[PDB]
Design an enzyme around this catalytic site. Structure first.
Site: not given
Ligand SMILES: O=c1[nH]c(=O)c2ncn([C@@H]3O[C@H](COP(=O)(O)OP(=O)(O)OP(=O)(O)O)[C@@H](O)[C@H]3O)c2[nH]1
Ligand SMILES: O=c1[nH]c(=O)c2ncn([C@@H]3O[C@H](COP(=O)(O)OP(=O)(O)O)[C@@H](O)[C@H]3O)c2[nH]1
Ligand SMILES: O=c1[nH]c(=O)c2ncn([C@@H]3O[C@H](COP(=O)(O)OP(=O)(O)O)[C@@H](O)[C@H]3O)c2[nH]1
Lengths: 297, 317
Positions: B109, B237
């Site tokens: 990522k 989150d």
């Protein structure tokens, strides 16, 4: 597990750099032919480690390799496998400016910026010459050329195949080249470096055939045709009698310059002979080849 | 012999970089303990070639690897050989910012400067948590963190083991946060080939996952531990990723491929988040479930833990 443990840090960098560049090259395909840009090319790596691998290496250092493709090809034409070169430099720190690899197979000479520029000027003609010799020549065999940067100071190195044997102990060494002779300081060393006057004032000769001279004439004609001077001929004598493996026993594919003495020699000897220091005129060519033509019998 | 051929220079540099650092790491002995220096450490190389080796790599690039000793240790702790890691990154270019290695085994990522900071800020507690749970966690398993510089531009990347299987096709995918708010997938997303559904799409579909008591309990114990850890570190989150693989559909598609000319069995040593469905269950399914996106610091973190766990509890029976 290559710890690059060395007598001092610049040797650790030499080991790390030859290891690095030779692996990187193993991931670069062998071309069908060298190209002119290969004669102007270089590799440069800058290492900047922080709290990491500082045990034997420095933390910040730079390594540059001049013309990696040209020198890999030369390595090939001289019959040296790349993994053997890498093993000779990294398996154990080089030893004693003039070094040899731990196994005495190759010599690492510190050189000047002028010498690096000079080799860059001679390199394409030198390489073509080595092609046309099929590597059968008495010139220095250049295997690599590197710039190292440690603690801000740059150091330049040229790796060549050793003139002397990497296994037989050499008993007398002559740097045959006005008139030059050995300083009494050098004359008192563990293995002296006798120069041109003391090969005549000592009465040594080297009894062998003529094809050595046939190769030498070609070499020095080439050196002069390239405007090179100041080169010497290095001569080593090994007295077998002084004394598993054996005496006078050597592998000619490894000690490429070695030569057995004739049965007619007084002592039982083996000689090693090659040209050195060719990084810098026409008269030099003839005077030097005359001197060396009168030493074989 | 590795060309590092890739469609973009940055991928080539990524392959070169992982190759270089793994081979360098193989000359560094393996420590008894980690030292605290090892958590502030980094390695940097700056390449400037000239007329040399420019077929695939750029002539000029930079590569930085963070805490290489710590991530080597983590790789060890997660059962991953350094040699295999290097081979999955370098044998062929990673594929489609989000990539996976060609063999689908690891996920790469692109992250932000702040994500790298937060990873440092949590790395020592994260390592010790992995140590005292023996690698049994739903959390991301971090294997590497790098900074690439190509064309004077810096790209941060974080390598993790895939939540999803590297062999089994995944037919439905949800990203669940347990938020009070309406997390629903766009008509844009819902129009993709494999869309990532969100909370309200998971509920308006009536999806449950029958896993069986033993695996359900191991799962809820894993998750309770993990998200208390995240709350401790004031992290929020984060999502739970769930992939569903339909065994029957896999067999049908497999045969539609073989006709152009075990089943539902996985290896938990590699597909570590994978669970088979209950013996007495409607369709034969395999699920992959893990926590993702845990690099964003500070609804409170303890409140986020509470709502998250309360939601994920009832997603499986
Ligand atoms: O808590 C931390 N402990 C660390 O050990 C640490 N190391 C890096 N960072 C964070 O990484 C981001 C930029 O990336 P980075 O630091 O690699 O760029 P840099 O500033 O060093 O180089 P440059 O861009 O000037 O050439 C910034 O948020 C850095 O503060 C750390 N945060
Ligand atoms: O065991 C060795 N194997 C070699 O292959 C070798 N080549 C040179 N040497 C020595 O190094 C100096 C020559 O250096 P040079 O470049 O010819 O001239 P200079 O003194 O200007 O540097 C002299 O001491 C030579 O005896 C070698 N020793
Ligand atoms: O280990 C993983 N294996 C995967 O195969 C995988 N696929 C997605 N993700 C994560 O899920 C979010 C993206 O979901 P998305 O909706 O497709 O894309 P985005 O939300 O950026 O628009 C991000 O956290 C991704 O890193 C995966 N993690």
């Amino acid at each position: 597990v290559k710890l690059f443990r060395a007598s001092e840090p610049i040797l650790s960098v030499l080991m790390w750099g030859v290891n690095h560049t030779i692996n990187e090259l193993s991931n670069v395909p062998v071309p069908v032919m060298l190209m002119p840009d290969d004669f102007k090319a270089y590799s440069k790596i800058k290492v900047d480690n922080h709290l990491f691998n500082k045990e034997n290496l420095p933390s910040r250092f730079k390594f540059k390799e001049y013309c990696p493709m040209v020198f890999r090809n030369l390595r090939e034409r001289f019959g040296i496998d790349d993994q053997d070169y890498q093993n000779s430099v990294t398996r154990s720190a080089p030893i004693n400016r003039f070094l040899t690899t731990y196994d005495r197979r190759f010599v690492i000479k510190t050189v000047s910026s002028e010498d690096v520029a000079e080799m860059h000027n001679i390199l394409k003609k030198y390489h073509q010459f080595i092609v046309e010799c099929h590597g059968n020549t008495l010139l220095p065999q250049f295997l690599g050329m590197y710039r190292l940067t440690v603690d801000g100071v740059e150091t330049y190195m040229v790796v060549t195949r050793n003139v002397l044997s990497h296994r037989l102990t050499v008993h007398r060494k002559y740097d045959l080249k006005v008139a030059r002779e050995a300083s009494d300081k050098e004359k008192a060393k563990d293995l002296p470096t006798f120069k041109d006057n003391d090969f005549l004032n000592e009465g040594q000769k080297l009894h062998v055939k003529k094809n050595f001279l046939e190769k030498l004439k070609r070499d020095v004609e080439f050196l002069a045709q390239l405007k090179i001077m100041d080169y010497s001929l290095l001569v080593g004598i090994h007295d077998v009698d002084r004394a598993f493996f054996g005496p006078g026993e050597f592998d000619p594919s490894v000690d490429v310059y070695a030569m057995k003495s004739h049965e007619s020699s007084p002592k039982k000897e083996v000689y090693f002979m090659a040209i050195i220091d060719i990084l810098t005129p026409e008269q030099y060519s003839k005077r030097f080849n005359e001197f060396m033509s009168n030493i074989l019998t």
